[PDB]
Design a protein around this ligand. Structure first.
Ligand SMILES: CCc1ccsc1CN1C[C@@H](C(N)=O)CCC1=O
Ligand SMILES: [Zn+2]
Length: 140
């Protein structure tokens, strides 16, 4: 589990969104595994606006923050899981690292701020849903 809190927005994995998130929906995309809902209180996170390919992510199944190199956001085939059939997921970045289903929501950060959240895993890889292209998260 995990979320990003920026301005009056909450960014979560679409597959982990709550009934309150869907009732207060701002934007969602199944192909990215992302959902953004509105909040009453202001958040403190800053979204990175950069093309960094190194950073640190939190892995809850190891209680550890790992430094990683990761690929640029791409369209990647993701095998079937409990939440989606086999499909291509867009805006996904991979790194060599550990990721189990309950690790989704763990933040990936660089020197500029939040880059994305854990979304995929298995086979010694970890996949992150990018949020750096969602510029509207910084305004109104
Ligand atoms: C062992 C596979 C694994 C490891 C970490 S997430 C995962 C499989 N997964 C894929 C997610 C997606 N974005 O399609 C949806 C939720 C989920 O359980
Ligand atoms: Zn950066």
């Amino acid at each position: 589990s995990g979320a990003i809190y920026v301005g009056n927005y909450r960014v979560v994995n679409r597959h982990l969104a709550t009934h309150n998130d869907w009732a207060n929906l701002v934007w969602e995309d199944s192909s990215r595994d992302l959902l953004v809902s509105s909040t009453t209180a202001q958040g403190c996170d800053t979204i990175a606006r950069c093309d960094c390919q190194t950073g640190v992510y939190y892995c809850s199944s190891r209680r550890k923050h790992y430094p990683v190199s990761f690929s640029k956001p791409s369209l990647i085939f993701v095998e079937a899981s409990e939440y989606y059939p086999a499909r291509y997921q867009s805006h996904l970045m991979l790194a060599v690292g550990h990721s189990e289903p309950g690790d989704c929501g763990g933040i990936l950060r660089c020197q500029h701020g939040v880059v994305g959240i854990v979304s995929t895993g298995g086979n010694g890889l970890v996949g992150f849903a990018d949020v750096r292209d969602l510029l509207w998260l910084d305004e109104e």
